[PDB]
Design an enzyme around this catalytic site. Structure first.
Site, PDB file in Angstrom:
ATOM      1  N   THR A  51       6.486   5.174  87.336  1.00 12.48           N
ATOM      2  CA  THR A  51       5.659   5.666  88.203  1.00 12.48           C
ATOM      3  C   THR A  51       4.356   6.046  87.924  1.00 12.48           C
ATOM      4  O   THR A  51       3.542   6.554  88.670  1.00 12.48           O
ATOM      5  CB  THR A  51       6.446   6.854  88.740  1.00 12.48           C
ATOM      6  OG1 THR A  51       6.404   7.885  88.235  1.00 12.48           O
ATOM      7  CG2 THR A  51       7.879   6.501  89.633  1.00 12.48           C
ATOM      8  N   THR A  52       3.967   5.970  86.460  1.00 14.26           N
ATOM      9  CA  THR A  52       2.527   5.823  86.216  1.00 14.26           C
ATOM     10  C   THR A  52       1.976   4.319  85.664  1.00 14.26           C
ATOM     11  O   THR A  52       3.052   3.675  85.269  1.00 14.26           O
ATOM     12  CB  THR A  52       2.543   6.944  85.038  1.00 14.26           C
ATOM     13  OG1 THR A  52       3.377   6.431  83.943  1.00 14.26           O
ATOM     14  CG2 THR A  52       2.826   8.303  85.560  1.00 14.26           C
ATOM     15  N   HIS A  85      10.277  13.999  80.951  1.00 12.00           N
ATOM     16  CA  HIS A  85       8.929  15.013  81.574  1.00 12.00           C
ATOM     17  C   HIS A  85       9.239  14.997  82.973  1.00 12.00           C
ATOM     18  O   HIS A  85      10.278  14.694  83.503  1.00 12.00           O
ATOM     19  CB  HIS A  85       7.755  14.071  81.299  1.00 12.00           C
ATOM     20  CG  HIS A  85       7.873  12.891  81.977  1.00 12.00           C
ATOM     21  ND1 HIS A  85       8.255  11.537  81.754  1.00 12.00           N
ATOM     22  CD2 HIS A  85       7.673  12.263  83.412  1.00 12.00           C
ATOM     23  CE1 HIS A  85       8.341  10.531  82.529  1.00 12.00           C
ATOM     24  NE2 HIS A  85       7.908  11.351  83.729  1.00 12.00           N
ATOM     25  N   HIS A 113       7.337  15.909  86.892  1.00 12.83           N
ATOM     26  CA  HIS A 113       6.256  16.126  87.978  1.00 12.83           C
ATOM     27  C   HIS A 113       6.347  16.973  88.977  1.00 12.83           C
ATOM     28  O   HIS A 113       7.627  17.278  89.443  1.00 12.83           O
ATOM     29  CB  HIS A 113       6.204  14.553  88.929  1.00 12.83           C
ATOM     30  CG  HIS A 113       6.498  13.488  88.116  1.00 12.83           C
ATOM     31  ND1 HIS A 113       5.361  12.681  87.815  1.00 12.83           N
ATOM     32  CD2 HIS A 113       7.389  12.794  87.301  1.00 12.83           C
ATOM     33  CE1 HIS A 113       5.689  11.610  86.961  1.00 12.83           C
ATOM     34  NE2 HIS A 113       6.882  11.584  86.918  1.00 12.83           N
ATOM     35  N   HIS A 146      12.221  13.414  84.882  1.00 10.31           N
ATOM     36  CA  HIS A 146      12.700  11.999  84.668  1.00 10.31           C
ATOM     37  C   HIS A 146      13.160  11.979  83.227  1.00 10.31           C
ATOM     38  O   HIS A 146      12.489  12.481  82.098  1.00 10.31           O
ATOM     39  CB  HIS A 146      11.442  11.113  84.622  1.00 10.31           C
ATOM     40  CG  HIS A 146      10.930  10.943  86.089  1.00 10.31           C
ATOM     41  ND1 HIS A 146       9.852  10.468  86.454  1.00 10.31           N
ATOM     42  CD2 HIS A 146      11.923  11.126  87.099  1.00 10.31           C
ATOM     43  CE1 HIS A 146       9.564  10.449  87.906  1.00 10.31           C
ATOM     44  NE2 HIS A 146      10.975  10.971  88.313  1.00 10.31           N
ATOM     45  N   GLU A 149       8.683  12.986  93.390  1.00  9.20           N
ATOM     46  CA  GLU A 149       8.117  11.565  93.434  1.00  9.20           C
ATOM     47  C   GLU A 149       9.101  10.705  94.556  1.00  9.20           C
ATOM     48  O   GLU A 149       8.699  10.564  95.624  1.00  9.20           O
ATOM     49  CB  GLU A 149       7.995  10.689  92.212  1.00  9.20           C
ATOM     50  CG  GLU A 149       7.064  11.450  91.290  1.00  9.20           C
ATOM     51  CD  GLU A 149       6.516  10.434  90.285  1.00  9.20           C
ATOM     52  OE1 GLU A 149       7.298   9.725  89.519  1.00  9.20           O
ATOM     53  OE2 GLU A 149       5.369  10.247  90.220  1.00  9.20           O
ATOM     54  N   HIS A 193      -1.284  13.953  81.613  1.00  5.96           N
ATOM     55  CA  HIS A 193      -0.662  13.671  82.777  1.00  5.96           C
ATOM     56  C   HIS A 193       0.597  14.190  83.073  1.00  5.96           C
ATOM     57  O   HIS A 193       0.965  14.767  84.293  1.00  5.96           O
ATOM     58  CB  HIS A 193      -0.700  11.937  83.311  1.00  5.96           C
ATOM     59  CG  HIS A 193       0.203  11.316  82.512  1.00  5.96           C
ATOM     60  ND1 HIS A 193      -0.678  10.508  81.364  1.00  5.96           N
ATOM     61  CD2 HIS A 193       1.556  11.286  82.312  1.00  5.96           C
ATOM     62  CE1 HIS A 193       0.391   9.861  80.604  1.00  5.96           C
ATOM     63  NE2 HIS A 193       1.440  10.134  81.152  1.00  5.96           N
TER      64      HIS A 193
HETATM   65 HG    HG Z   1       7.974  10.381  85.479  1.00  7.90          HG
END
Ligand code: HG
Ligand code: HG
Length: 259
Positions: free
Chosen positions: A197-198, A93, A95, A118, A105, A63
């Site tokens: 957020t996942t 990580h 996004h 993040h 995000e 992901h």
């Molecule tokens: Hg994240």
């Protein structure tokens, strides 16, 4: 579903069916309305102590890609700001998007950035990560926006290893990386109470989102988009657009450390 991801058939609009907390009261990310955020003079400056950080590995989890740190002792911690107590960095990580006008995000006055970093930390009073995520003040995430502009020298080591973790489940040794090279000059921030957020989407996060973005070059972000969601030997699906859209604020206030 089948398993969640970011496609048309298993993307964020479907998550609630396996993770009902998706429609919860404290879900992330949100849009930061700058004119409605409350300056709060009682918030303290953040304290970021990453000089003894030990990175260990970089992994493609299907992901995103996480760079993981040794968190068995207080080596790289965050404290101060709106936090009580010491939070240890466990991983960072990103996004990002399929184009430069999307990818973050959080949004600022509805502005989307090209990506969002993040840096995930967990509250030492809980003893381990897995117990932290079960508590309302268990994690603190620093979120940093990336815009496309000049290259970020300190991100280059990450960019360069990506070819070796192209597909899901790959990992590579990744020692001696200093995450100080990923901070903007200013530590001004917004803060609010939110969630991962996942999936599993737990509402255990105090978000600390930095006002000042960092710049990366087009080439750098181009290398992110070459990763894959799939595992080796499966049909290729490039890892792009792995961001959840903004959720309703509900009964929450965003506070600003600055005016
Ligand atoms: Hg994240
Ligand atoms: Hg929680």
């Amino acid at each position: 579903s089948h398993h969640w991801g970011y496609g048309k058939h298993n993307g964020p609009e479907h998550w609630h069916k396996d993770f009902p907390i998706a429609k919860g009261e404290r879900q992330s990310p949100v849009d930061i309305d700058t004119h409605t955020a409350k300056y709060d003079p009682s918030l303290k400056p953040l304290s970021v102590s990453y000089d003894q950080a030990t990175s260990l590995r970089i992994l493609n989890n299907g992901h995103a890609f996480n760079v993981e740190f040794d968190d068995s002792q207080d080596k790289a911690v965050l404290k101060g700001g709106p936090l009580d107590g010491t939070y240890r960095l466990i991983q960072f990580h990103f996004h990002w998007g399929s184009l430069d006008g999307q990818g973050s995000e959080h949004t600022v006055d509805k502005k989307k950035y090209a990506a969002e970093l993040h840096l995930v930390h967990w509250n030492t009073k809980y003893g381990d990560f897995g117990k932290a995520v079960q508590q309302p003040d268990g994690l603190a995430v620093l979120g940093i926006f990336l815009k496309v502009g000049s290259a970020k020298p300190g991100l280059q080591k990450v960019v360069d290893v990506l070819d070796s973790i192209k597909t899901k489940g790959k990992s590579a040794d990744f020692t001696n990386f200093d995450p100080r090279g990923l901070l903007p000059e200013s530590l001004d921030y917004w803060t609010y109470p939110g969630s991962l957020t996942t999936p599993p989407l737990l509402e255990c996060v105090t978000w600390i989102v930095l006002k000042e973005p960092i710049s990366v070059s087009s080439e750098q972000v181009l290398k992110f988009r070459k990763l894959n969601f799939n595992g080796e030997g499966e049909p290729e699906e490039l890892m792009v657009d792995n961001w959840r859209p903004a959720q309703p604020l509900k009964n929450r206030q965003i506070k600003a450390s600055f005016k």
